[PDB]
Design a protein around this nucleic acid. Structure first.
Lengths: 411, 184, 415, 43
RNA sequence: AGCUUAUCACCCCGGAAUUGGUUUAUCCGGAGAUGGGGUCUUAUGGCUGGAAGAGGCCAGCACCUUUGCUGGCUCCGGUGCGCUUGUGACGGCCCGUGAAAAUCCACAGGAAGGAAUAGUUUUCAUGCCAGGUCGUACUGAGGUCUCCAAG
RNA sequence: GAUGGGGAAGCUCCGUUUCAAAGGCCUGAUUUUAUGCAGGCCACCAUCGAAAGGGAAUCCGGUUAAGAUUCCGGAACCUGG
């Protein structure tokens, strides 16, 4: 052989720069990143960064060559091109002054579907449920958003619809194990086909949207997770449960627009799923309902709200320092009791949960050696000193918790 | 700087359009109808878009779907071919003839303003063959005419004639004289 | 709130709330999902191996120091008499007369059990003139003759003291005057200071080492260029320069115990030179850069190097050209490293006022690599203007150690 | 040495630099929009 | 392949006419000579390994036999107006100032990156794999070119 | 000696950087009236043309009827990953 050129072989055809990926695809950076979001493609780290370049030490991100080289032939890229053609051919109609032909161009418009993009991403159903962890976190955030000029109302209404479908199913087949109310929101854990998904729901207050965040990146994630959730929910309902999609009662959606609405027709294993059976809870006005009625209906209780007005009831959930009525028939609880009954599973006594007293701390469900240092190498001294510092920074923080507990317990 | 061949050619043609002395049958163009009167001409002309190929197809299938199973006046539209406009003018069937100032061979439309002044047809040289194209389902039109009209638009058209006579033909009586393009 | 974002343990302030109604709508929630979304497609994904193990299984399995007795623990004899820092030491082969040297221009000889000053000789008269001081002193290894070398600046003074008597002394004296850089007859002032002979040179002598016999002694002068290593002999007054070139700057040179070869120890190298062939044999590459002092195992198999860049390196002369074990524990420049002669022990005196003592078994017949274990960190030495222990020498027959700090005080350590 | 195989996201660089940059850019386009409103009222 | 060996050139000390040094060839020195001391390139040599286990010269012992075996020695030097060739420092001959490119290295520069259950960097040492096509025989002697050259 | 150009009824000739749009790389939270790509860096020119010019790295011993720096034994080196 002739002397081969140096920096064109091993790591140079294994990886490519962002610029080289964009150029090779002949696609805009935005659309390159849109496809990258849909396909689940990410930058990868080579063992040599400069052999992955053509010699240069430079701030560079490396994609996998065969990954981009596999993205090139794909229906979604072709449909992006078709959207670009449609865009100019519409503004041709609009810019001239003809409205009827433009309106007709809307009628003769097909759009890209993210159907086949999931088959190649999550080939098995249990793999899709391993992703639904991050998928349900976007979607439940986007339900609790005011619609802006960035994000249309149709987007939020469809996202909220999927959210309500998810909440309805989990409360239907009784698949909750753990709850955790934090400052951030309310965490749930759910054995969905026996693999424990986790997801977060914010509190139902108006959310201050920063102008800092980019509502074009988040919209494509929503666009992928949305379709992914449609296919997941069809699979779940048509396997073990119900018809999809279920209908919604109009005068129920006028009252709550939550979870007691949206009725679903068809044609246990865990202690949590057997709890609250033959119990009827009267949720008061003061507590948030949609974060709580999900849990009651999931375990096996029943809900009658103060809100619905605007019997069999055995417990009332009230958050006031002064409670007015006080009947002999009901038992009076601050919601912390429910948030502990789900976590333990053993029905915690309501003696520490009376209206007017302070709640329990609410835990999450989640010499010679200095002399024998010497005979270690530098490649072992560096590592051992690092492990010593990592244990020290833990133990001193544990000492901080103990010292703070002692300083508070005195007061 | 270094430009392409065609860019240099169209820039050279632009400066050549100015710097030469030009014959008065040309430069009778570019002495054209002003912004208000042009907008007001199109506020009338936009009410008579020739029925686009899609609209005509759907309506004539509506005729078939109705009339085969279980009176109309003649509809008025703008008239838009040069063979047809110079047919309409000289037959005196034209009340307002609109002429583009920018035509690919200039020699095409040079007789037309003076033939309109001959026949007594109230013409207006309006700016843009693209702008005429928009009102007529075509890319370009070179000419647009308004023969007959609905009676709601009749008085507005007659006033559009009188406004164009006063604004265009009276301000540009000097344009039949005077060789254009003596710009230093 | 002072710390920059994304290099922060919590994305939130932890807060206490009495009621569930009193829980605020968390404002920085869109920011968290947006940043996670960016972390998915923009942050590079790497396959890592997390080393889930105890720290205790990183220390090598080494025998506990209690089963390797004896070794010195605490100090016994404090030698307080100097006005200047004890730069050097030397012990007689018999084991009483401990010689010291300082920048107060005063060579003092002490005992080992008492700490009494049995002798004093003063070499320079204008001592605080900083141009030249007493650098290195060496007793004669020969059995019962008592010849002491003293290197002060540009000349070597062979003092035979009036300590001993007549038999041992005149044995030493007749060994000096037998022989009759230049060798001078001592003048009147030089006769007062008990100097038998002075060997004057052009440049400053910094180190000295005898043969196993006591006939030859090697002297090293930095900045002497070519003749930076000189072999002198007393029996003939012959000054030999054994090599026609020198690789850069030389810091040390010591003879092999029994087989005739010299280990010239440069700044960067240790070069094994045979003298029966007058060639280079082996070349040691220490992992360190700058080499203070060398010492050879009494069986002549292994070797230690001390270093100004904090290293102390155990060279096996059978195993490789690299160090067998690099150990880098000291806080400052490793000033002196020395073997004990009888017992399997070696010390390491750095510039931090700290001597570390080590046990080192050497296995001769079997092809088995020598085991080196630490024993005790000896402390208590005073640091005088960023300067600790200048020298350390073992007692010939037992596990005692003589130190020498910048505190103008030598110390003796005991089991 | 009994090591557990797992995946690790490296910290996305220039996160703070771009964060503050977008914070500034948003405010700048707001102010430019206000200036456009006033200048259009002078027409 | 591992050590080792240097003219030139350069660096420090030193300050020179009473003019010195120096070549085969009269050039060199207050723009720093002789002198004292050092640094560098590995030209080309030496020792070591390859490697004596190979090659050579002998000797002895077996043989229809495709039947070889067994012992030695294979060392120590010298020399030149010599021939061949390689290399170093000079000196002439010119306004004649002395092909290009592939390839490889280096400097200036200061962008970027780099830590507490493997921080960043491998021009350091050791370890792994691979290297396609075509030519390759022979001759080549008034009549094409060219290399080696005993007494 | 193509290409760009320009001749020539034409077969084809002139011309070798010329008034050619001659292309190959980097930057980015996704590009602010909402998911249609923005900004920057560099300025000569395809190619052929040497088995005697420049050029990475292989030697010794052995072996055939005829092959050897190519085969074998031994011992090497270079280049790329």
């Amino acid at each position: 052989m002739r002397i081969k050129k140096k920096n064109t072989r091993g790591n140079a055809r294994n990886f490519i720069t962002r610029s080289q990926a964009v150029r090779k695809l002949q696609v805009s950076l935005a659309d390159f990143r849109r496809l990258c979001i849909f396909k689940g493609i990410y930058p990868r780290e080579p063992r040599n960064k400069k052999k992955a370049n053509k010699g240069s030490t430079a701030p560079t991100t490396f994609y996998y060559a065969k990954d981009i080289q596999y993205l090139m032939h794909e229906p979604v890229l072709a449909k992006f091109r078709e959207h670009k053609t449609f865009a100019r051919k519409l503004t041709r109609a609009l810019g001239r002054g003809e409205v009827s032909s433009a309106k007709r161009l809307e009628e003769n418009r097909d759009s890209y579907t993210l159907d086949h993009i999931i088959k190649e991403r999550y080939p098995s159903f249990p793999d899709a449920i391993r992703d639904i962890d991050d998928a349900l976190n976007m979607l439940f955030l986007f339900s609790n958003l005011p619609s802006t000029n960035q994000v249309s109302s149709k987007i939020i209404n469809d996202a909220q619809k999927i959210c309500n479908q998810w909440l309805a199913y989990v409360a239907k087949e009784r698949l909750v194990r753990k709850v955790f109310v934090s400052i951030k929101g309310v965490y749930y854990q759910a054995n969905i086909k026996g693999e424990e998904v986790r997801w977060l729901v914010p509190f139902k207050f108006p959310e201050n949207i920063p102008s800092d965040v980019d509502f074009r990146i988040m919209l494509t994630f929503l666009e992928f997770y949305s379709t992914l959730l449609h296919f997941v929910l069809y699979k779940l309902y048509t396997d073990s449960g119900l018809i999809y999609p279920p209908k919604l009662d109009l005068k129920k959606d006028k009252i709550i627009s939550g979870l007691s609405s949206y009725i679903l027709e068809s044609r246990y294993d865990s202690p949590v799923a057997s709890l609250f059976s033959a119990f009827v809870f009267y949720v008061s006005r003061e507590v948030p309902i949609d974060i709580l009625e999900f849990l009651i209906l999931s375990c096996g209780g029943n809900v009658i709200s103060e809100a619905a007005m605007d019997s069999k009831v055995t417990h009332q959930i009230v958050d006031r320092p002064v409670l007015k009525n006080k009947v002999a028939g009901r038992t009076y609880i601050q919601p912390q009791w429910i948030f502990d009954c789900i976590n333990k599973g053993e029905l915690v006594p309501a003696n520490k949960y009376l209206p007017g007293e302070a709640l329990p701390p609410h835990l999450s469900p989640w010499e010679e050696k200095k002399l024998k240092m010497i005979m270690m190498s530098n490649k072992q001294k560096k590592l051992y000193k690092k492990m010593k510092y990592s244990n020290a920074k833990k133990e001193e923080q544990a000492e901080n918790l103990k010292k703070k507990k002692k300083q508070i317990a005195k007061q | 700087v270094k430009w392409p061949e065609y860019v240099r050619v169209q820039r050279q043609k632009k400066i050549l359009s100015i710097r030469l002395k030009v014959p008065p049958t040309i430069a009778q163009f570019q002495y054209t109808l002003d912004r208000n009167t042009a907008a007001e001409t199109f506020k009338l002309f936009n009410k008579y878009r020739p029925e686009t190929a899609a609209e005509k197809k759907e309506r004539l299938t509506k005729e078939a779907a109705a009339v085969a199973e279980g009176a109309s006046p003649k509809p008025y539209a703008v008239k838009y071919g040069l063979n047809h406009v110079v047919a309409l003018i000289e037959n005196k069937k034209a009340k307002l003839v609109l002429i583009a100032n920018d035509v690919d061979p200039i020699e095409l439309v040079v007789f037309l303003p003076a033939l309109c002044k001959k026949m007594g047809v109230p013409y207006a040289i309006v700016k843009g063959k693209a702008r005429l194209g928009t009102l007529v389902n075509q890319k370009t039109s070179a000419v647009a005419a308004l023969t007959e009209v609905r009676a709601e638009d009749e008085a507005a058209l007659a006033k559009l004639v009188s406004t164009i006579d006063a604004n265009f033909a009276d301000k540009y009586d000097e344009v039949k004289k005077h060789w254009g393009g003596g710009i230093l | 709130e002072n710390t920059e974002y994304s290099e922060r343990e919590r994305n939130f302030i932890p807060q206490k709330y009495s009621a569930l109604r009193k829980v605020p709508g968390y404002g920085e929630s869109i920011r968290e999902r947006f940043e996670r979304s960016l972390d998915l497609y923009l942050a590079p994904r790497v396959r890592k191996n997390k080393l889930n193990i105890d720290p205790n299984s990183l220390i090598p399995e080494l025998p506990s120091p209690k089963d390797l007795r004896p070794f010195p623990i605490r100090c016994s004899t404090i030698y307080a008499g100097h006005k200047g820092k004890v730069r050097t030491l030397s012990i007689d082969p018999s084991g009483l007369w401990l010689a010291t040297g300082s920048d107060d221009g005063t060579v003092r000889v002490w005992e080992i059990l008492t700490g009494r000053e049995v002798y004093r000789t003063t070499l320079i008269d204008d001592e605080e003139n900083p141009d030249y001081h007493i650098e290195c002193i060496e007793w004669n290894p020969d059995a019962n003759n008592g010849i002491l070398a003293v290197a002060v600046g540009e000349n070597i003074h062979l003092i035979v003291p009036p300590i001993f008597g007549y038999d041992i002394e005149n044995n030493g004296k007749t060994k000096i005057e037998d022989g009759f850089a230049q060798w001078n007859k001592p003048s009147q002032k030089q006769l007062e200071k008990d100097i038998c002979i002075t060997i004057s040179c052009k440049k400053t002598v910094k180190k000295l080492s005898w043969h196993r016999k006591g006939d030859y002694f090697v002297t090293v002068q930095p900045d002497s260029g070519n003749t930076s290593v000189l072999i002198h002999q007393v029996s003939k007054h012959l000054t030999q320069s054994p090599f026609k070139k020198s690789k850069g700057i030389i810091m040390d040179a010591k003879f092999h115990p029994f087989k005739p070869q010299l280990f010239v120890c440069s700044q960067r190298y240790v070069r094994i030179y045979d003298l029966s062939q007058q060639i280079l044999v082996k070349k040691l590459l220490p992992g360190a850069r700058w080499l203070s002092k060398i010492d050879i195992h009494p069986r002549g198999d292994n070797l230690i190097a001390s270093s100004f860049d904090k290293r102390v390196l155990w060279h096996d002369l059978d195993l490789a050209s690299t160090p067998y074990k690099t150990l880098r524990y000291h806080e400052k420049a490793v000033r002196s490293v020395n073997f004990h002669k009888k017992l399997p022990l070696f010390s390491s005196a750095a510039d931090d006022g700290t001597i570390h003592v080590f046990h080192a078994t050497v296995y001769d017949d079997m092809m088995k690599n020598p085991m080196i274990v630490p024993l005790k960190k000896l402390t208590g030495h005073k640091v005088i203007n960023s300067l600790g222990v200048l020298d350390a020498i073992w007692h010939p027959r037992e596990a005692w150690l003589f130190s020498a700090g910048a505190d103008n005080t030598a110390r003796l350590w005991t089991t | 040495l009994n090591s557990n195989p797992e995946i690790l996201l490296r910290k996305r660089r220039n996160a703070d630099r771009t964060r503050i940059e977008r914070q500034e850019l948003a405010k700048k386009k707001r102010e430019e929009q206000i200036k456009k409103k006033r200048s259009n009222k002078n027409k």
